[PDB]
Amino acid sequence: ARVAVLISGTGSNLQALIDSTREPNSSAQIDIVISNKAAVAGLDKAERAGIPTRVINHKLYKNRVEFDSAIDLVLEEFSIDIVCLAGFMRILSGPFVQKWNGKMLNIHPSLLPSFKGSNAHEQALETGVTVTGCTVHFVAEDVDAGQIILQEAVPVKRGDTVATLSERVKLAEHKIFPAALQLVASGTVQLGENGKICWV
Template identity: 55%
Template sequence: MTKPRVAVLISGRGSNMMSLIEAASEPGYPVEIAVVISNRPEAHGLARAQAANIPTRIIDHKAYADRASFDAALDAVLADEQVDFVCLAGFMRLLTAEFTRKWYGRMINIHPALLPSFKGLHTHERALEEGVRIHGCTVHFVTPEMDVGPIIMQAAVPVLDGDTPETLGARVLAQEHVIYPAALRLVTEGRAALRDGRVVVDEFELMPPALVVPPAF
């Protein structure tokens, strides 16, 4: 059976992109990483994707007059590549409401905080400033409003005395690499479903709380 084709959108180094590519290289993983798309021609993740034999496309946002025209070009590339599902992996562009509505339920994002806390940028610095003792990351469906879509999976890490944004960020990033491929699997296998604006995960609904919710296995 043909696997769903996934596009990974990046703007930088492609760390989470590589976690998805590596997961998809396993025979039992349910998707094919069909293309990596960057809005920045200089993004290091493009070379990493090419080294993994993944096709790449560049849509330089500077070549477009506004977000709507950029999103139209992006949508055309997704259609050309016959993409079924989109993963944002460090993609530093706000997408228009029209685009996100079209892809609702078929586009997910990884955010380096436990949403709904610390939406937006500089999440690790803000977590340290606020003195939280637990921090983490979230995979969620993308909606028109930034960082508020239905949550699929989260992972938490402790905030340690003496942490810097760099040490805390590294601890969170390690969990991002765990839960992003796990969440993509749940969604594309139909085990994480949208119901009334929330995500219901079938076999994990009655499991006890865990550091990763739902458990990443």
């Protein structure tokens, strides 16, 4: 399976995905890395890995459709099979999500369905949970509500901040994102006919 990784910043999940997909038994290959923001560190990690990069500045498009369309163009250029959202912080338009239904994965730093949205760690700390975690799911049109592929629980420790909680959660993210990509790339897991996870 040919994989595009979309990023908005540091790219630690990108790097974990790079590492896993270079294992001999990997069913995924990362053929293109796309950032909506230049100068972000994830672009350096891709270039150190020999992976082509493209920056598509969402700020230069009238609307989301033209912007997504620009992304879709690059995906087609690289004959992409699978899209990984790895710290990509833009919401994608309906038609783009539909076109890639069952082919696009996102990592979210909570145990969905808890703490959807952009500040999961803040929400988890304000709520006072002692267990949080992270989720890889298929991207559906309903944000952070697509079908769940893998999750891993992570303890919240007393005194945790966004800084320390997200550091601990990311170690789990770097485990289940590569595992989830391999499940999809190998065809072991698909978005089933009925839209629920299908294990083959």
